[model samples]
Target: STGSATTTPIDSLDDAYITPVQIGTPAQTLNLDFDTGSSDLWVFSSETTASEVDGQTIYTPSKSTTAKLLSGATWSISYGDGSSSSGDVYTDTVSVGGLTVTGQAVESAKKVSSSFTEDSTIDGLLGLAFSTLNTVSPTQQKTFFDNAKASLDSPVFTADLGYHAPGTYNFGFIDTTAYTGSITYTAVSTKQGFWEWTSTGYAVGSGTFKSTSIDGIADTGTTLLYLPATVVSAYWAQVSGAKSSSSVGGYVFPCSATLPSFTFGVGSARIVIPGDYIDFGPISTGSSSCFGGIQSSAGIGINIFGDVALKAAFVVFNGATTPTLGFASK
Candidate 1:
């Protein structure tokens, strides 16, 4: 359903940040984050300084014949985690699976720092999340989705992030293959410019953890499921041999024993947070598998439903007619 088109130079800023149709695939064929916040699809380059670029994968654009760099344009971005990257802007042929788009605006970061550099497994992130978090505008660039949405086969675009694999940002048009023949609609409030929803309640294992209703925002860009404090505490208390370990980032416990199975409730939808998703890494001083599912965010009140929660169901963000969100299966 995707093909190349002439660069449509947007004459107005009103339509600058719409739904992004652009996706970045590295030479390794890894699908990058499709962020709508920024306009450029930046991947690390092999020419980067070792210290500046640490944990993220550095991609060489030269390998792709469709890649082209724009001269006299410079770009840099700082993340909430304090990591940053900067490079010259360029236009290249951006592809997703069989979809090929020519003259797609992209960023090639020669200088990068922060956790992104140290966590070097990923090639780079695609800026299709949102323009509010974009670093490509002001320099006069439209988001990938805003520019290319008209060319897509479907009016709706949804990403199916893998449950077990955190890196796979699987994207495609909405398919009715797995639909249950029922649709729930949520009217989108355009104030914040991001898709968010409020849940009725949250339950872990069997008990209703929180007395108050839980509210969460659905973020496609974030990969982890960040729950409210009361919900997190209730979950960790159920896991076997689960001691309150907060150093490596979550509710990790001793490593010598088999972990317990846990499930979370989202209204009527019961979602399972698989044990593998919580198994962080090799144990250092203990014998239990490091749990990655439940983490302690003491003061962070908001619940964030990231890719981990999205994989259990299908999500449709319809910006075609009015701002609205629809979820289906497959």
Candidate 2:
């Protein structure tokens, strides 16, 4: 089986992307954040507290004949940004684009933090990370990608994210026409439940390439590219007004600053993110200062190759026996 879905950015700088997923017998479709950094396909539900529901569309299991409670099973998920949700579990027919799986576990949230409600467009999250990261208690459930893997034409999914534009996520087959040149595949360590790999250093614009190993995950859920302090400083040093602002909690620069393109090597391939993409957005609406898409990850320990880096390349998260990540230029 093969499925294709389009991603719509909910914010001006492509803060987060949404993909519509259909659930249950009557096919109640809701827009969900497709996250590759975490596992747990949880949703806004009929049981969600009235105070927390806001304008989010909720899933009413009682209305779906195909929905069945996974008795005694419950889940709670907390994110790095302090957002969290917890609730009971249910099994239902879940469909993403053209693919459908009948026994998919759908966690229905009874409570959610206000942090998640800041964006009403996001009604739920559909995780594409390894199933082992699932938060269900007693009996861990598989992710949508995990349950549908066997039925897919290939145990792989490709993400073709764009800059402030609709992108495509295709499961089971790689569309060669969507990318240029051949794909460069790299081994990923699924032991930690992440699509983790080591990159072959980086380069700032026309500057010389640095030869070193940089470990990170392809986190589609995150909005920025977080790298080591040295690498981050090197890139920013080229911009006159760029500085690490303690007040903003990260780096910011003059809106007129010319950002150098950032490039990272994967095997033999070098994916270059245009300078324009690094200019995140103004700190405040109409402000002359802007934030950067690339920041330092030292505070978090592990570097994350988030949407900033991902949207610049064609990425494939391969779920074969020995999991691997493939990168190609678009």
Candidate 3:
């Protein structure tokens, strides 16, 4: 099977991308965040308490003739950023783009955290990580990609995430027209339930690329690029009037600062993230202070190659016995 889906940026936030998905027999469509950091396809639904929900579109499994409750099974998840949701399980038909997965486990939210409730546009999350990391009680669930892979022409998907524009997520087949040059392949360690890889080194601006190994995850759900404390400090040192501000929570610098370009090594391939992308945005309206897109991953334990870093390249998530990552300039 060869299928593709279009992803759109969330308003002006540039934090997460949402893709339309069809669920159930009659097909109730929901805009879900394609998250690679976790392994659970969960959604806001009628099962959720009205008091716990805000303006999110809720999925009603009862309306679908194909929906079947997975009795006694439940799922709960908490994100690194403290956002969370929990609910019961149901097996139903789920389709993305044109790829359909029959009897796929769908976790319907009965409760959601304030972070999720406040994000009214996002209906839920669709996990693209390895299925082994799925979080269902009694029996672990398979991700939509995992269930559809066996019938797919190729067990792969490409995430062509754009900075502030729309991009396409192609499944089952690679679209050569979407990227330029050759793709550099690197071995991925999925033991951590993520597209985890190591960077040989990094550099600030045109400076020498230091041979510092940075272990990180390609997390589309996360908004900023998080690196080791030392690496973050090094990058900020070159910016005048930059400091680790408790007020802003991370490194803050004058909005007028001429930011430097950042590059990281992926095997022998060097991927460069433009300097303009490093300035996330102004801290507040009409404020001269800007928040650095690159921040310390002190508490997170691993670097996160979030949207800021990922939008720079076309990423291929290969699903083989030993999964690999293929990157190319977009």
lDDT: which candidate is best? 2
Runs in model 1 lying further than 4 Å from the true structure: 2-31, 35-40, 50-72, 165-172, 178-183, 208-213, 240-243, 255-276, 281-289, 298-302, 328-330
Global lDDT of each candidate: 0.54, 0.93, 0.90
Q: What would you estimate as the lDDT of candidate 1?
A: 0.54
Off by over 4 Å in 2: none
C-alpha RMSD values across all candidates? 8.1, 0.8, 1.1
Clash counts per candidate, in order, are 29, 0, 1
Instruction: Give lDDT tens digits, candidate 3, residues 35-117.
Output: 98888999999989898888888899999999999998899899999988998999999999998999999999999999898
lDDT of 3 at 29: 96
Model 3 stretches with alpha carbons more than 4 Å out: none
Which has the greatest TM-score? 2
TM-score of each: 0.73, 0.98, 0.97
Can you write out model 1's per-residue Cα lDDT over 1-330, one digit (the tens) per residue? 643221111111110111123333343354355543334577767666677765555556676666676767777887534667887777776665556666766777778776656554545666654445556644655555655567777555554444433222223365455456544555554455456565555556455544355556566545556776666777677766676644655666555544443454444544555544555444453544555555544545456666555655556666575766665433
The predicted structure with the larger lDDT, 2 or 3, is 2
Clashing pairs in 3: 1-153
lDDT of model 3 at residue 298? Answer: 95
RMSD of 1: 8.1
